[PDB]
């Protein structure tokens, strides 16, 4: 495989809760 994205995919597993709220805020401003 590309190798790169498989190292970066380990940072996804950090378990954050605010990023998925802030994306929704940045969408909801244009409703």
């Amino acid at each position: 495989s590309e190798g790169l994205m498989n190292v970066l995919k380990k940072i996804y597993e950090d378990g954050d809760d605010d990023m998925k709220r802030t994306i929704n805020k940045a969408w909801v401003e244009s409703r």
């Binding site: 954050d16 809760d17 605010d18 802030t22 940045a26 969408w27 244009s30």
Partner: protein, 90 residues
């Protein structure tokens, strides 16, 4: 627990994907859809700066003329943050 940076890169995602989501699931913006992002995010309504936005669009389209990809749109925001002058001084 990467929350402070993850939500800031999440702001750039949540801005960008509104404008591609106008036509589909894609991770790219076409040159006129990119200009829609600029005018709808940076609301210069009735100002003379749209002549500067068509040149800013040509600076963005220099990555690819047909449609500008999300990663190159972030590379351009990296230049925009560097050219801010005061930001990298305090």
């Amino acid at each position: 627990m990467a929350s402070p940076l993850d939500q800031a890169i999440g702001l750039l995602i949540g801005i960008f994907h509104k404008y591609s989501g106008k036509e589909g699931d894609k991770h790219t913006l076409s040159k006129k859809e990119l200009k829609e992002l600029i005018q709808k995010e940076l609301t210069i309504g009735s100002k003379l700066q749209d002549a500067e936005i068509v040149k800013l669009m040509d600076d963005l389209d220099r990555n690819k003329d047909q449609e500008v990809n999300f990663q190159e749109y972030i590379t351009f925001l990296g230049a925009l943050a560097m050219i801010y002058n005061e930001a990298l001084k305090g």
